[PDB]
Amino acid sequence: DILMTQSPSSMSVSLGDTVSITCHASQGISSNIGWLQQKPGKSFKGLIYHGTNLEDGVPSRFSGSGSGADYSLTISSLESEDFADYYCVQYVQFPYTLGGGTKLEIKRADGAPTVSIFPPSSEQLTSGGASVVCFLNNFYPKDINVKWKIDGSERVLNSWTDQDSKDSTYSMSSTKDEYEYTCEATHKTSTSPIVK
Amino acid sequence: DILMTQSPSSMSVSLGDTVSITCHASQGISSNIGWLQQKPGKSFKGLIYHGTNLEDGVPSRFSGSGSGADYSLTISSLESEDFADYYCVQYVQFPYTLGGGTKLEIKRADGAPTVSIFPPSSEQLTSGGASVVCFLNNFYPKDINVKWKIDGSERQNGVLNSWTDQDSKDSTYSMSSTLTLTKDEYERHNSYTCEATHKTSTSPIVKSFN
Amino acid sequence: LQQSGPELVKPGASVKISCKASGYSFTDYYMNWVKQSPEKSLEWIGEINPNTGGTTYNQKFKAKATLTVDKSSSTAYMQLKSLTSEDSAVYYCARYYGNLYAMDYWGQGTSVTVSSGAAKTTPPSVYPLAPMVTLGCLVKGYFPEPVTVTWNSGSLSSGVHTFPAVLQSDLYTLSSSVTVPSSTWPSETVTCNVAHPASSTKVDKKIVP
Amino acid sequence: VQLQQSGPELVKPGASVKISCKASGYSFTDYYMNWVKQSPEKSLEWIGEINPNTGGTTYNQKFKAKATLTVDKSSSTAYMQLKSLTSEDSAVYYCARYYGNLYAMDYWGQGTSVTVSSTTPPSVYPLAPGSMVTLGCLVKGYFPEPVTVTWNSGSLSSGVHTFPASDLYTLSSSVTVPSSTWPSETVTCNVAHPSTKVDKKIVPRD
Amino acid sequence: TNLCPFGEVFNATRFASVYAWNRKRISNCVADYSVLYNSASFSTFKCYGVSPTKLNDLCFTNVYADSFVIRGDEVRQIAPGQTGKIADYNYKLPDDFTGCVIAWNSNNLDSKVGGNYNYLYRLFRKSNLKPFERDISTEIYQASTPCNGVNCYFPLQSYGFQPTNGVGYQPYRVVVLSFEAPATVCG
Amino acid sequence: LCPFGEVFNATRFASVYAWNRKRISNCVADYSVLYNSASFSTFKCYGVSPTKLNVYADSFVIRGDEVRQIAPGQTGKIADYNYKLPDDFTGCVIAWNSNNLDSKVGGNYNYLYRLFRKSNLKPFERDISTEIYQAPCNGVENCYFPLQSYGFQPTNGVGYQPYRVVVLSF
């Protein structure tokens, strides 16, 4: 097989910018490389074929460059609908390697999670179970650590959301005989572990 | 009357920021100043009363400061739902005068108008009228000037412009300019030019047709 | 905080505006009224006190506005006398508690637009605008506002710029831009759809090169 | 021209499943049909390629024992059948449109969700706290997806964070509303499970 | 042409309790009212039937100056048509009032450490006061059994003025000017 | 060793209508040197893995937008009238851009392709007929020459530049 190593894994870019994603094959592929785009939650779209040639639609903002084993997809004056995923596929030889994948994100100026603690309900206990919820809303970026503390001792299912496109930030949620209570969180924003 | 002069008229701020709007009365009002906000498409809401006091159901990000005749509204770690208009009101004496107003917008980078030519339609002419449209889509900032040129000659009359109100999701502005004339005079000229001056280009490349 | 719906009235006419305060005791709160003009200015119409309350106006309006309240219906009215020139604006009812306080809750409910003296309801005259290419749809000479302008029955929504109307010679002018790829058009049909409730008009114009 | 694809299926391990992709809007006769697998682990893998003019297959040696990529020109469709279908290879599957050498896959289909892991009504519980208070709605122990969570009659939409889901599913939603809206006015979390419809009004622990 | 003695009303070292509000009659004097509403020292300045910048070019017979002290959250009550303990039981303005209500924060003069208890207000009464009425009753408030002068409460309550109080509990000085034969006060 | 140099590095290539065939036999081959040369744009193998394969060599010239047609089960002027691959093909298709060798100012017309034919070719058939196509012609130009020459200029777009193709059959 051919090896495609496209870089970077992800990057946070502002609007109106010009970005370039690189793609590097383990051998020359003589410009038989295509570029694909997938919007969030939606399907894929072919943008570039045979190195520098453009697909149907495909505004002038997009372009391709490179040769040998090094190639580049370029966007200039980045538009709103460009924060998505992009891939470099190769068709020079079976099997199609398709490369690893690059993500685009909006660069924001940090954030502060509105972490709220949530003791268990009564009906949950009547059924028998016991679960304590810890919501952490509207923070940036994705990397963050959360710990639980039962009477001081560090002891759970975590779920993340993607960028709420309005505020451009993330959010996370962390969840009887044993039950009969602390949410230690650590974020880049605070040197000290804000907790509820 | 008391005169409220709040500054600045507008400013472009990024998310997560901390901003302060100034407000200046013609005389000391001993902290009897209130603060108002209007979101796009939604009503007003009192935030601050008696200078420094915050109302029920209003986030901790807001605060007030000042004394005498100089006062300031302050926001810290700005969230998405704060891009709106703000006003300072005085209640020290009749009549209640309001400030001028400060607006907040998202700090974006520059842009390039998609300025188009758009020659007049056929049905418009069969009815009798003649109007040449010049669309200028997706540019930033508000400061832009547009002129029309009939084969080089500046024609101020006969121009109708319409502006768009919000950056919205696209985070950008847009404009439409129509040189609408009468048929008898439209059928006498060859060149038709839409010279748009913006900060981006020192010389304003134009769009024209014959 | 509900208010009367927007009305479009012609000069020489008196209009009355209602504001029903809900969620609190309407009886012991001053009710202010405020005008918002399009010069980025907010003028003060005035103030009324319910439950045995005198009214105090701004001198600019002491001759133009009349303020009333009804504790039983828990509402406050403001009537505008005569036609307010071509000066149509938006009007609000505020909620004052007293000195060393501010206006807390506001109603945007009512918009006031005064028609021109010589008026006739007219359906729009719509023309396509042919030269990522930008296409246009020009909606000229209609009355009154508003006139919905969509593309392919709401299909095309991204890259669409429907510009606000403008009052010229007592009629309205609107224009819309749609940015569709140079490969989609003229391959796929573009139809600007314009709706005018006043004349009960629905028109669709296809753009052809 | 934007294609179409088979609906999602809920299958058990060891089972064969067939997936459809119907070509309309172009000349189906002169386009290779590729298939692609995208998963949380090892995302965007290449299933393979077929020529519809003959039905010859050139699937890559990877797996290659679990998929068969037959096509039918007459109905203008391409099929992919998954045979092995282990528990771990649950993913979304795509059908692409290849034109030939010195070209790329241009048009893609919306995509099918396949779950091979081994009916349960939701357990809905309000989440009350102990200027802007956050409330919650916890949906524990339901099967299968999906559930729809709304607040009131869809009124409260701003400031809502509904997070994604032992062979059972766990879901939670947070809504941050001002201290004047709650507990002054009722907030009712509405949960629908396609034949369950439940309404939980949020009451403080006290 | 002897000037009006506004210094002795506004700059008095001690003010009266609201239940025993003071009245000074002003007569035979020329006034320059600008110096009051342009002094910028005031938090409230509400005029009724007259403009602050248009009150200097008019003549009245006499001017009554009623002065007292209240708490911040009670300044709203010094207006025509208002209710509450101050407006119902202490100081009540008529509906046809054609005067001005001037108020300013007085934390620096009437509060002290340990509390200033010299300022009192009436808490209970059998009925609402009439316009401009003064009540100096010291009768036990009857809330069925007679009180015999000893459900029986002291009618007046003292203000707890501490410098650390919030602004709504800080002291505010209030002056009510009422305007009313030949005219002797002019500008 | 196998004479792969004389096939891939031949100074002149044949027209697609008259594609050349070289038989390779009684030789040891190192196929690595091919897939590590990095000089090729297309390299599709069928029914065999090139990484593990360690013989007829058909060579010709076509234009870029016709390279897609050099595959089993394809249609079009090249596949129908010039060079046709069987469905059970078990070989490899190697192509590389030759604009620097087969184009010149004013056009290189030595390369021809068949434009018209009465019926499709069979797999691996060659047709060098030059009889006038009846769209009777009596051997004189509704009467057309069957072959048309390629206009290979270096300034041509990539879809019109010359591409050299080598088909290995086992």
UniProtKB/Swiss-Prot annotation, chain F:
Outcome when changing S41F: In strain: Omicron/BA.1, Omicron/BA.2, Omicron/BA.2.12.1, Omicron/BA.2.75, Omicron/BA.4, Omicron/BA.5, Omicron/BQ.1.1, Omicron/XBB.1.5, Omicron/EG.5.1
Protein task: Attaches the virion to the cell membrane by interacting with host receptor, initiating the infection. The major receptor is host ACE2. When S2/S2' has been cleaved, binding to the receptor triggers direct fusion at the cell membrane. When S2/S2' has not been cleaved, binding to the receptor results in internalization of the virus by endocytosis using host TFRC and GRM2 and leading to fusion of the virion membrane with the host endosomal membrane. Alternatively, may use NRP1/NRP2 and integrin as entry receptors.
Effect noted on mutating Q153R: In strain: Omicron/BA.1, Omicron/BA.2, Omicron/BA.2.12.1, Omicron/BA.2.75, Omicron/BA.4, Omicron/BA.5, Omicron/BQ.1.1, Omicron/XBB.1.5, Omicron/EG.5.1
Result of changing V140A: Increased resistance to neutralizing antibodies
Positions of region (Integrin-binding motif): 63-65
Glycosylation sites: N9
Intrachain disulfide bonds: C2-C27, C45-C92, C137-C143
Domain BetaCoV S1-CTD: 1-170
Region (Disordered): 115-145
Lineage: Viruses, Riboviria, Orthornavirae, Pisuviricota, Pisoniviricetes
Domain of life the protein comes from: Viruses
Outcome of swapping N156Y: In strain: Alpha/B.1.1.7, Beta/B.1.351, Gamma/P.1, Theta/P.3, Mu/B.1.621, 19B/501Y, Omicron/BA.1, Omicron/BA.2, Omicron/BA.2.12.1, Omicron/BA.2.75, Omicron/BA.4, Omicron/BA.5, Omicron/BQ.1.1, Omicron/XBB.1.5, Omicron/EG.5.1; May enhance affinity to human ACE2 receptor
UniProt-reported outcome of changing F116L: In strain: Omicron/EG.5.1
The protein's name in its UniProt record: Spike protein S1
Subunit structure: Binds to host ACE2. RBD also interacts with the N-linked glycan on 'Asn-90' of ACE2. Cleavage of S generates a polybasic C-terminal sequence on S1 that binds to host Neuropilin-1 (NRP1) and Neuropilin-2 (NRP2) receptors. Interacts with host integrin alpha-5/beta-1 (ITGA5:ITGB1) and with ACE2 in complex with integrin alpha-5/beta-1 (ITGA5:ITGB1). May interact via cytoplasmic c-terminus with M protein. May interact (via N-terminus) with host bilirubin and biliverdin, thereby preventing antibody binding to the SARS-CoV-2 spike NTD via an allosteric mechanism.
Effect on the protein upon substituting N9Q: Reduced viral infectivity
Chain residue ranges for the region called Receptor-binding domain (RBD): 1-170
UniProt-reported outcome of changing Q148N: Reduced host ACE2-binding affinity in vitro
Region described as Receptor-binding motif: 97-163
Outcome recorded upon mutating K104T: In strain: Omicron/BQ.1.1
Region (Immunodominant HLA epitope recognized by the CD8+): 108-116
Consequence when changing F145L: Increased resistance to neutralizing antibodies and human covalescent sera neutralization
Effect of G5H: In strain: Omicron/BA.2.75, Omicron/XBB.1.5, Omicron/EG.5.1
